[PDB]
Design a protein around this nucleic acid. Structure first.
Lengths: 60, 60, 62, 60, 60, 61
RNA sequence: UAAA
């Protein structure tokens, strides 16, 4: 798995990320946690993002 | 599983949440219940939403 | 597991409730749920059509 | 399985069908064969349709 | 499997094909090769197309 | 498997500039740094992780 | 950063 180390490194070092959804919309925040299906993305509070709806994840 | 505690917290408290679908549609209501593949969202109606059609679940 | 979906669709089927099925592409289908399995729902209006669940976003009583 | 008897009846009886795709397009033909993943649809030509791209199948 | 025979027939005879994607884009060329998840489509250059994105494969 | 991995591995090893077209039509560009069963790491200014479920086509630029 |  490249995905888990890539996300764990963004999580562990509290890096700001942009998550682009499959419809083009860009979300931003920090990865609080993730599992096989979802990413919890936190600003004030965490929204839950389904991985099946994500196209790309980048630091920024 | 991160989904179950995340959704059960919203369900127990009956707070408003926005469910954004992969096609951009925003649904607004309370999480009435859920299972492995669907969420029941309650406003003036109770509607069953397939998780495969959901991008994000965002507490209001 | 399926403890929500199956009783929700079965109740609609049993009581012949007019339903709306919204597809992910935005189209609204209407009819009665005649039956369903793991992957499809049979929706009856003038005739029965097989709707793939993977194409569906929402199901609600009309 | 409801899917398999539904499609087999159309196939065996040579029923003209409309297959609606997830982008709204309607294809028309007779079902030549199908498996877990695809339906082969015959009109003027033979074409392979992936089930994941189908929303609806109905006799025309 | 209906895919392997269908696609091999096109590959073998060098049939010009249209590969329609679920988003409506029409790709055109000849089938160079394929596996369980992708089709290699050759025209100006050789492009790898994910089957999960394909709606239909049809002669041009 | 037997076609996907050699295709992507050759692009990776020679550091070929590639175009990755997403299902929403957007075109991404960069170098394939690495890949696994579910994602491609795509390198340009930064490294971004691209989910394969969101990709329609991969082609050298 | 979005179609109550």
């Amino acid at each position: 798995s490249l995905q888990d180390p890539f996300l764990n490194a963004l999580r562990r070092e509290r890096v700001p990320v942009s998550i682009y959804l499959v419809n083009g919309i860009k979300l931003q925040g920090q990865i609080e946690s993730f599992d096989q299906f979802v990413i919890l993305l936190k600003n004030t509070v965490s929204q839950m993002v389904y991985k099946h709806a994500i196209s790309t994840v980048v630091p920024s």
